Design a binder for this molecule. Structure first.
Ligand code: CUA
Ligand code: CUA
Ligand SMILES: [Ca+2]
Ligand SMILES: [Ca+2]
Ligand SMILES: [Cl-]
Ligand SMILES: [Cl-]
Ligand SMILES: [K+]
Ligand SMILES: [K+]
Ligand code: NA
Ligand code: NA
Lengths: 584, 581
């Protein structure tokens, strides 16, 4: 029976962490499951007024040149793995809007690295190497562009117009390699060995019109032999593009002939999801325009890459007919797959091995249950489904139209992320969770897979550059309350300890570029401070033992108040200071 | 009183949460406490484009340059002391603004930078006869003018001001110069009186200096009298602002016509009007009391019929350590947060008034432990004469161990408490991001929202004017207008296709894309993102939205629909082609 409790009462804790994509809003959200309450927001591609992410020097340093963008579009959150199990170190996420990948450190729940993927447009599909560990982050660039894209050629049928599959080194967050592909790229997953990855393609037609993109009854799943790519990179057998030293391998077909890096497995039709079963047997492609999933036997891939198979379709071992609009698939670890039907507006539960038998002509009932969802589901996620610990307890289906499921709030509606108990034979819908801005996908982890810090380490790399700047000024950040003058630059350093800033007044000249660096020397957990300069667009958080810094121009003469924004003490309202700006 | 709202069931109340330092307003359902929507106000929102779009930046004015805000105090407009559901107003402490949200479309539609002040904190609405004015406190004393010649806060021209904004026009009505400073504010149930707490009666600018006096005050304003001075032209103006400024300071011990200063201990904070209209209740903060000002006595105070401003105080109950804010069940009880004791204290107001006269009565009914360090609290419909005594939310600043660890930054804990009976019962812990300070609840039937946009909506009227000047009919046209180094692309959109799927411009052109969503089905939103240009916006059904960006990169640049709108959403794309210089 499906019977688990969803209520988490006052004083009780959730059993799992949920990491939600922020969708078009650009952040990552931490939820407790099964309460479905949002515990934290982690700013990534958004600018966050509260913490100052996007304003502070530390955050802008992480974002690099891309700190000029105030937007992102996130879809695909994934947690780093060791030996096919979550290791709790990192969360990675895409940015479709400005072509980035970000890394979040799960001990501090902050974005700590970010990369603009070179020579591509729109980072969509993203998933992680599972075994031996997450060495690579694999990311799809969705859109075909010219190379170079310098405005001389615009034609997407040109021989140098393409997109690429991308591998980022997880630990360094520098590029590892790129593989040029035929067609385009939608979603991606990885096997349980480290050798193989796979991605769906919906535009095998290389067409730039809606209808053109649906002409072929089959596109493909493209499979990558990562070992062969790695070998070619070691041999120096690669080109580079634009200004990037990233190794670029060519995985396109040449006059019908396969490269060593890729195989193209025909699959109907504009397929979307690409999901690796938790037993490691299958890459399962969701058929979208075709009312099917296609099951690729991972076991057969070495033979495919060796030329031992007559036809690339020989790796397909199942093509179950499921219903209208299949988009994404997940796993209970009991041998069932669960697939979203966008058009039928359901989740379909189906037995994978039976579908494989059906494909060989046995008459079997692989469909177990169809559950109505509300409405038009996209992704779905079962607890621990990306790991060999898939536990079959909870499932979340993320549906794009909520219609009448919540109180009306105007023309813009929330998404409906529905919690489903899958612990028994029958799926049961237990909670409707409204969410903002279209999280597309989410990922769950056991409470015991995530270990967080209670207060910051003074040596944390997040603010290491600030610590270096201080050293150059002769400043001991744990103690000093000083104003350094450097031409028209002023560098204010202070400690803070509730309810007092360590520097409560300073004076500068109109036009000076002021940097304020604050170290919160409280040691009690949860005593955060803030810093806001009135009417100057200046806001940041400083948590216990953190150093944070922010730069602004003092372009207004007169007296300008600053205050602590984070309620920190009974005397919080009085935790203030004054900047005096002498007229030009 | 059940809190579970199962699948297919709806919440009973709307809750409008302040976003705190994050800058937005959040719409919640109560009692599920689930967040239904976020309304961008002072933040920049990637999803909808608020802060990026032309419509949003027009509303924000010059303050569109700021990417931050600090909001505390959401309030819903009233008619005859009851919510009318038309508007929600909120402060911005960081960049000195007031914003108005239109509740039919759940969008910010007006915003004002309050002139000649620093830090808009306390905010509340006129109740009766209706919300003509929004009252807003500027917290921090500054020089006038603030030109860098005088920094002394003891100067006669160093002060702050109480502010009244016309609710319907969102222009300034008037400002009142006060002694001291201003923290929170409320209004009576007649329209004549408003009141604000002050914590710096000392006009001191060190921590100790600000706590020198046992008593600061509540400043009470005679709004009728202020309006009169403004009508007669008996006002000054400051700097470049035409706003009428009245002087409410004492002069050589003599009262102004506009104000009375009622001494209250100590660095008082909350300032709340009881739902029966009888009292302004000031929370004592550093004093373990609230002070109860009898609104009935204020006309006598302003007429000079009372000997001593303290004669309007009719209760000063001792409640516990760190009282910050008070709310009402409509049954004669007040509920006050004790920040230091970490409790909500339920107390009987009439009994406290009897205790002040020396009767031995225990006006304290219950103290409920909350988790931990509560700031504001809010009982359902407490700001109206319909206060219903059902639900109470206490908004606590430290959550400690009440939720899964998430790192050094913790959520706030907004706790739902059933107050329908004699005994307060804690029912739900709601984690929230970024310190919502206060919140406001409304019955489902007090809010009426639009399902799709009106083509005449003022929100995008300026864009409609731009289109008109170009000869464009937004409901139909798909055209590129060329105008020097400006390019104005106009298109309709209807799932799964943009009306214009390719256009060509020159490197350096300032490109405006205006999109009108001509779907009529509810909930079919589209988006528009230009890859690698930092361009993102929402276009909901029948909305027109527009965005301007520089085509600074030669070559082919994709654009796409960000809002999953149709089975063929991934395919709702286009291409901008940029010719090199
Ligand atoms: Cu520091 Cu509030
Ligand atoms: Cu339009 Cu998705
Ligand atoms: Ca296709
Ligand atoms: Ca004082
Ligand atoms: Cl997928
Ligand atoms: Cl208040
Ligand atoms: K939606
Ligand atoms: K807090
Ligand atoms: Na980087
Ligand atoms: Na305005």
């Amino acid at each position: 029976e499906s019977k688990q409790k969803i209520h988490v009462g006052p004083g009780e804790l959730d059993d799992y962490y949920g990491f939600w994509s922020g969708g078009h809003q650009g952040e990552v959200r931490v939820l407790g499951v099964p309460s479905m309450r949002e515990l934290m927001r982690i700013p990534v591609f958004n600018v966050d007024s509260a913490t100052g992410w996007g304003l502070t020097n530390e955050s802008r340093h992480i974002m690099g040149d891309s700190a000029k963008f105030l937007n992102g579009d996130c879809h695909h959150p994934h947690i780093s793995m060791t030996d096919g199990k979550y290791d709790g170190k990192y969360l990675f996420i895409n940015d479709k809007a400005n072509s980035r990948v970000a890394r979040i450190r799960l001990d501090i729940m902050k974005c700590d690295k970010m990369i603009t993927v070179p020579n591509v447009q729109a980072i969509h599909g993203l998933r992680l190497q599972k075994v031996p560990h997450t060495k690579y982050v694999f990311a799809n660039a969705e859109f075909i562009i010219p190379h170079p894209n310098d405005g001389k050629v615009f034609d997407l049928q040109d021989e140098n117009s393409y997109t690429m599959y991308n591998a980022i080194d997880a630990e360094t967050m520098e590029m590892a390699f790129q593989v040029i592909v035929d067609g385009n790229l939608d979603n991606t997953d990885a096997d349980y060995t480290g050798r193989f990855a796979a991605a769906t393609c919906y535009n095998s037609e290389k067409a730039f019109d809606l209808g053109g993109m649906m002409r072929n009854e089959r596109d493909w799943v493209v499979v990558f032999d990562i070992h062969a790519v790695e070998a070619a990179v070691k041999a120096g057998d690669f080109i580079t593009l634009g200004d990037s030293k990233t190794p670029v391998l060519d995985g396109r077909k040449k006059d019908g002939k396969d490269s060593k890096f890729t195989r193209y497995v025909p699959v109907p039709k504009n397929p979307h999801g690409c999901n690796t079963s938790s037993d490691g047997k299958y890459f399962i492609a969701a058929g979208k325009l075709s009312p099917t999933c296609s099951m690729i036997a991972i076991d057969k891939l070495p033979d495919l890459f060796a030329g031992k198979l007559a036809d690339p379709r020989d790796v397909i071992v199942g093509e179950p007919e499921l219903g209208l609009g299949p988009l994404h698939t997940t796993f209970d670890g009991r041998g069932n797959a669960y697939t979203t039907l966008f058009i039928d507006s359901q989740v379909v539960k189906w037995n994978m091995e039976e579908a494989v038998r059906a494909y060989k002509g046995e008459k079997v009932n692989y469909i177990k249950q169809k559950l109505d969802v509300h409405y038009q589901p996209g992704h779905l996620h079962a607890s621990l489904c990306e790991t060999n610990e898939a536990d079959g307890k909870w499932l979340v289906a993320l549906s794009k139209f909520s219609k009448d499921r919540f109180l009306p709030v105007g023309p813009l509606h929330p998404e409906n992320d529905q919690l489903i108990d899958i612990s028994g034979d029958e799926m049961k819908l237990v909670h409707d969770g409204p969410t903002f801005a279209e999280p597309h996908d989410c990922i769950m982890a056991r409470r015991d897979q995530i270990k967080t810090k209670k207060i910051w380490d003074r040596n944390d790399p997040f603010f290491a550059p600030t610590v270096e700047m201080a050293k150059k000024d002769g400043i001991n950040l744990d103690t000093d309350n000083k104003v350094i003058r450097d031409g028209n630059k002023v560098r204010v350093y202070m400690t803070s300890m509730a309810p007092a800033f360590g520097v409560q007044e300073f004076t500068v000249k109109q036009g000076d570029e002021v940097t304020v660096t604050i170290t919160n020397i409280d040691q009690i957990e949860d005593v955060s401070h803030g810093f806001v300069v009135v009417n100057h667009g200046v806001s940041m958080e400083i948590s216990p033992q953190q150093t944070s810094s922010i730069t602004f121009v003092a372009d207004k003469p007169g007296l300008h108040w600053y205050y602590c924004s984070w309620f920190c003490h009974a005397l919080h309202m009085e935790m203030v200071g004054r900047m005096m700006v002498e007229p030009a």
